[PDB]
């Protein structure tokens, strides 16, 4: 599917195998939340992103 819809002209299509354990996330791998413990602002947070 990813090879097929790699040249899709309207948006993005991504196929991800489901996470091994239900309820521990929406996909397998790593989950990281990039916080702003100081209040740098939305633009600064996107910059860090």
């Amino acid at each position: 599917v990813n090879q097929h819809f790699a040249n899709l002209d309207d948006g993005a299509i991504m196929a991800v195998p489901p996470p091994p354990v239900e309820g521990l996330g929406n996909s397998g791998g790593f989950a990281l939340r990039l916080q702003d413990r100081a209040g740098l602002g939305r633009d600064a947070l996107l910059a860090a992103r």
């Binding site: 040249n7 899709l8 002209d9 309207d10 948006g11 993005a12």
Partner: peptide
């Protein structure tokens, strides 16, 4: 109203997957 001239080849697809200056294939 401005910034376009007749005959300009504008891309109307895959705008989410193109960066400035990247090479693309017209259809």
């Amino acid at each position: 109203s401005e910034g376009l001239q007749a005959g300009d080849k504008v891309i109307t697809s895959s705008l989410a997957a193109i960066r400035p200056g990247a090479k693309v294939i017209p259809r």
